[PDB]
Design a protein around this ligand. Structure first.
Ligand SMILES: CCCCCCCCCCCCCCCCCC(=O)OC[C@H](COP(=O)([O-])OCC[N+](C)(C)C)OC(=O)CCCCCCCCCCCCCCCCC
Ligand SMILES: CCCCCCCCCCCCCCCCCC(=O)OC[C@H](COP(=O)([O-])OCC[N+](C)(C)C)OC(=O)CCCCCCCCCCCCCCCCC
Lengths: 87, 70, 459, 128, 177, 101
């Protein structure tokens, strides 16, 4: 039960959730693509992404850490730290 | 096979204490129970009988088990 | 009783003539030999007590207390042999000599046929406990713990002795083998009222009664644990022996006078259970639980029914063993964490599993889990108090809730939860500690199989 | 329109519905900054005393021993017997004792006057 | 108001937290995905219609009305994630989070059962104990006077030097031990 | 200007470093082993099991079993001669001088 996930697995998952979002075009996204700078979304879209990741991984991210991680690579780093990958 | 480690407190002292307790109680419990079943199988539990006339019993001749009499 | 007093007075030079590293081994071995030898006192008959000589006798009542006392000495010697390693050798021998003298005065207390002899050595016991409490403690308040412990107890008994001497001028003999046949009924008058008060108040203080219980928590949160175990387990039983030896002479005035004492004991045992529900120290919590148990014993002997006497003796012995092993638990925790706070060290089941098992067994035996002797005595006292009056069971029932509620809670915050992060000196189980804990626990379970040896003088 | 959720002893106001969060006076942020400074000093001290490889022992919090000393040992020395304290002590000290004494007393006279006249059924009561 | 780093919550953060909590309660209200999506789009459109409002006091009063209706119209039992506080499995696996220093207490007859792990542990401990004086030197000169003003830990400013106060935050065991 | 010159307070002495096989008795290993053997022999193997054997086969505590046997005789008498089981008078009612009323 609950198999461990590697960093590339959660990376595939986060890029999949980003590609399934209508506001993100499926070509310009990257791990370090800033939401306000590289893509120019709003704060509400950032909280939408945070809720999508919370529902996808089935656990709650605190609001301060929800607003602090500001790139997909930060999301990958936080998920990999909380699940403690590469055991 | 991704054999990970689980950190646990040292159970050597508790296991050693339990082993010492069991060994030190069994070291006398086995001879005691062996002697008890041997006197219960060979020496024999006594039998009820009425007091004869003109013969008083000892103070230890009023009980049933031989260990109680001893 | 010369076959046990002479071994104690002859072990006294043995702990004085021992080597610099074999005091503990020799004293423990020879005290365990005396503990085995003490089983010969059970030559009991259904009609006559084993009257050894003119000034020594032991019925079915005092024999379990004697066995508990000289089984309790080696447990105290093991429980007090850690922190006295840096203490000087002469003072180590002084401490062991004080414990030996305390045992000798205790065994001479329970077998004294004359009540004057019983009183004389019953507060010859006062000197060694006072010396141990005041000298070998660990806080400043031990000095105050030498006052409230002393000036209570003597203030209860300096009247009492006079009353005893008055009986020597009235009956002509204070012997207990005589006074069972020469006893006269006590009329209703103010003089007999004050004689009853004088004969009652000393052991009322020594139980302690509620209102007079202030000396018990102040003398337990600071003691060396040998002193804590002797105070909680066997020194409080002198009040029970005073009840079951004195209440023969105080009939029938006890029946229509002990009403406020029973009210005080019941509502104070409710109060002390509630105080246990909101404590922060392990030692104070165990001491207040002991106050509740002795208030229950007070009610049990004050209603004076045979079922109550059975329950009082069983509850006395079971509470002594349970409180001694609970103080051993608290001493292990205070040894490991160097503090007495309950909320400081939590979640020790994650680190110490066998001490968690002993904690669980202590808590289970504290709240009278059947078929332990604690439940036997508590149930017999419950039925006797229901026979005294109906409404008393309500005043019992709440307590039997509360005496569970802290008894697990005192476990839970000390054993269950997230462990304290900034504490890292939690050593594993020393074999000496767990051997002491098992030596406390195994007789308490074993006596449930054969309770008839500890069921008082009228089983 | 909307139910006004009243404050209660067992139901405090939430951290979000309290108007005290939403006032923009300067001493509010000054007090919050000084509280954060105090908390930062305490946290820094705890982390320096707590991450030490050399230290093997309990980090002695002065607050714990301070609270345990203030709970018991600091009640009598700052106690003055006035009308309120003496009234509360007399109300909670001798009241229930008198109540239980009178209840158990009248129960005893009722039971005794029932049993001397034979009205109390004691047919099978031989264990007492 | 209570934060490890900040002392005051900006109105933007309060608006975002209201949006998060209200939409989570809305998701807990209507279970199905289609109704949740429709009402979530409605709530997002409402917050967008009130997004273009640069007056601080007007957004202050609108936030107060919004919090009042959110508390007036919330579910009694909102959905809580199984690892979130208040969940069904909150701190359930914490009974197996034995700290590392218990390995100090192991018997030498069992310390030879895993030789490589224990050698790695002693060299890690050596690394930590030589880095301790370097990191306390790092804090002893970077900290402002009168103690720190915020609880944010500084990073490691030098190559090869370990992060300061790194041990007890990196030492916590895995959540599934 | 330092008051009442005293040695610094000693730390908590640990026992598992200088001797990992210590049982909490003393510092000398032979003393520890002898103390452990003495208590585990004379406390468990000597008092518990032998005391249990002694109190299990104790000779008829308070003649309780005897209290059955004579009673087993007594009813066997009075169920064969029509006598009542027990009487309301503990002693002989004809051998008591009743006081005047
Ligand atoms: C813990 C502190 C409180 C302790 C309280 C202890 C109980 C309270 C009562 C104790 C009274 C003293 C012992 C009396 C023994 C009497 C025995 C007897 O047969 O009496 C019948 C005798 C009767 O007199 P008689 O026997 O000589 O007369 C012949 C008989 N008749 C009456 C028929 C003619 O009683 C007395 O003589 C008086 C008894 C009452 C004494 C009152 C004074 C003392 C008051 C209590 C002081 C308690 C200590 C306070 C300080 C504590 C320390 C700070
Ligand atoms: C005494 C007062 C002071 C207290 C401290 C004392 C310190 C000194 C202690 C000395 C050693 C101990 C002495 C007392 C020993 C008491 C025990 C004893 O010997 O009893 C004699 C009694 C004697 O039995 P008896 O009384 O029926 O025998 C009558 C006597 N004869 C044989 C002569 C006719 O022993 C037993 O009862 C043993 C019964 C068999 C063994 C147990 C079998 C079942 C085990 C459990 C199975 C699982 C059950 C379900 C569990 C569920 C989960 C919980």
């Amino acid at each position: 039960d609950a198999p461990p996930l590697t960093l590339e697995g959660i990376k595939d998952r986060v890029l999949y959730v980003l590609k399934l979002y209508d506001k993100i075009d499926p070509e310009k996204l990257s791990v370090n693509s800033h939401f306000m700078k590289d893509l120019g979304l709003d704060s509400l879209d950032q909280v939408e992404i945070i809720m999508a990741m919370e529902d996808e991984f089935g656990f709650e991210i605190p609001d301060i850490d929800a607003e602090k991680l500001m790139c997909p690579q930060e999301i990958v780093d936080y998920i990999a730290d909380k699940k403690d990958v590469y055991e | 096979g991704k054999r990970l480690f689980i950190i646990k407190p040292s159970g050597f002292y508790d296991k050693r204490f339990l082993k010492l307790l069991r060994f030190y109680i069994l070291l006398t419990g086995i001879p005691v129970v062996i002697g008890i079943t041997l006197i219960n199988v060979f020496i024999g539990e006594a039998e009820l009988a009425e007091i004869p006339e003109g013969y008083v019993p000892e103070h230890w001749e009023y009980f049933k088990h031989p260990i109680s009499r001893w | 009783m010369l076959k046990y007093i002479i071994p104690t007075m002859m072990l006294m030079p043995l702990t004085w003539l021992s080597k610099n590293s074999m005091i503990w081994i020799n004293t423990t071995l020879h005290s365990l030999l005396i503990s085995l030898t003490s089983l010969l006192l059970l030559n009991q008959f259904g009609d006559n007590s084993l009257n050894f000589s003119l000034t020594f006798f032991s019925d079915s009542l005092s024999t379990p207390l004697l066995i508990l006392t000289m089984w309790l000495l080696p447990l105290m010697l093991m429980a007090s042999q850690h922190h006295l390693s840096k203490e000087n050798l002469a003072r180590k021998k002084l401490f062991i000599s004080m414990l030996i003298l305390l045992q000798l005065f205790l065994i001479m207390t329970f077998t004294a046929t004359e009540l004057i002899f019983f009183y004389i050595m019953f507060e010859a016991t006062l000197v060694p406990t006072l010396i141990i409490i005041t000298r070998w403690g660990n806080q400043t308040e031990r000095l105050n713990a030498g006052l409230y412990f002393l000036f209570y107890t003597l203030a209860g008994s300096l009247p009492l002795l006079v009353a005893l001497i008055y009986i020597q001028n009235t009956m002509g003999s204070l012997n207990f083998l005589i006074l069972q046949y020469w006893v006269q009924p006590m009329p209703n008058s103010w003089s007999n009222t004050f004689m009853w008060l004088a004969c009652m108040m000393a052991f009322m203080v020594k139980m302690p009664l509620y209102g007079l219980h202030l000396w018990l928590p102040k003398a337990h949160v600071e003691a060396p644990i040998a002193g804590s175990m002797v105070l909680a387990a066997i020194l409080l039983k002198l009040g029970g022996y005073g009840m079951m030896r004195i209440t023969l002479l105080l009939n029938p005035i006890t029946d229509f006078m002990a009403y406020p004492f029973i009210m005080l004991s019941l509502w104070g045992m409710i109060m002390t259970s509630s105080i246990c529900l909101r404590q922060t120290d392990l030692k104070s919590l165990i001491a207040y639980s002991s106050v509740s148990h002795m208030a229950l014993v007070i009610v049990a002997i004050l209603i004076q029914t045979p079922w109550s006497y059975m329950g009082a003796t069983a509850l006395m012995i079971a509470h002594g063993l349970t409180s001694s092993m609970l103080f051993c638990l608290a001493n292990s925790n205070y040894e490991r964490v160097h503090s007495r706070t309950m909320i400081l060290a939590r979640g020790l089941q994650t680190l110490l599993p066998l001490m968690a098992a002993w904690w669980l067994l202590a808590s289970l035996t504290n709240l009278a889990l059947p078929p332990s002797i604690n439940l036997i005595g508590e149930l017999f006292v419950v039925m006797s108090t229901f026979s005294w009056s109906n409404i008393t069971i309500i005043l019992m029932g709440l307590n039997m809730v509360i005496t569970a509620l802290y008894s697990l809670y005192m476990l839970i915050t000390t054993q269950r939860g997230k462990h304290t992060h900034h504490i890292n000196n939690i050593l594993p189980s020393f074999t000496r500690e767990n051997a002491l804990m098992s030596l406390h626990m195994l007789p308490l379970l074993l006596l449930s199989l054969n309770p008839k040896i500890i069921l008082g003088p009228l089983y | 329109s909307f139910p006004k959720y009243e404050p209660s002893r067992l139901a405090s106001l939430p951290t979000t519905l309290d108007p005290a969060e939403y006032d923009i006076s300067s001493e509010t942020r000054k007090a919050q900054a000084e509280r954060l400074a105090i908390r930062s000093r305490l946290k820094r001290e705890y982390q320096l005393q707590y991450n030490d490889p050399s230290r093997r022992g309990v980090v002695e919090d002065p607050a714990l021993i301070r609270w345990t000393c203030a709970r018991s040992a600091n009640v009598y020395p700052n106690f003055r017997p006035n009308t309120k304290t003496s009234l509360l002590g007399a109300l909670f000290g001798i009241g229930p004792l008198i109540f239980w004494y009178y209840v158990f007393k009248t129960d005893r006279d009722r039971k005794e006057k029932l049993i001397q006249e034979g009205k109390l059924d004691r047919t099978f009561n031989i264990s007492y | 108001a209570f934060l490890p780093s900040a002392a005051y919550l900006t109105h933007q953060q309060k608006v975002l937290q209201l949006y998060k909590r209200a939409l989570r309660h809305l998701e807990s209200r209507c279970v199905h995905r289609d109704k949740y999506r429709y009402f979530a789009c409605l709530l997002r459109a409402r917050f967008d219609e009130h997004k273009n409002e640069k007056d601080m006091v007007k957004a202050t009063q609108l936030l107060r009305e919004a919090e009042k209706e959110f508390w007036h119209g919330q579910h009694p039992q909102p959905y809580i994630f199984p690892e979130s506080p208040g969940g069904t499995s909150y701190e359930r696996y914490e009974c197996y989070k034995v700290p590392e220093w218990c390995l100090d207490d192991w018997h030498p007859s069992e310390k030879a059962m895993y030789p490589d792990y224990f050698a790695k542990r002693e060299q890690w401990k050596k690394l930590r104990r030589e880095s301790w004086e370097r990191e306390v030197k790092q804090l002893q000169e970077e900290t402002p006077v009168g103690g720190p003003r915020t609880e944010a830990l500084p990073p490691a400013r030098k190559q090869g030097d370990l992060p300061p106060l790194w041990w007890h935050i990196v030492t916590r065991p895995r959540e599934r031990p | 200007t330092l008051r009442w010159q005293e040695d610094p307070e000693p730390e908590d002495e640990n026992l598992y470093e200088k001797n990992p096989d210590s049982h909490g008795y003393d510092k000398d290993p032979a003393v520890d082993v002898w103390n452990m053997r003495v208590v585990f022999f004379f406390g468990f193997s000597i008092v518990l099991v032998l005391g249990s054997t002694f109190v299990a086969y104790l000779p008829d505590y308070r003649m309780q079993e005897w209290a059955r046997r004579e009673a087993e005789r007594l009813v066997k008498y009075r169920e064969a001669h029509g006598l009542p089981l027990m009487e309301s008078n503990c002693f002989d009612p004809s051998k008591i001088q009743l006081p005047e009323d």
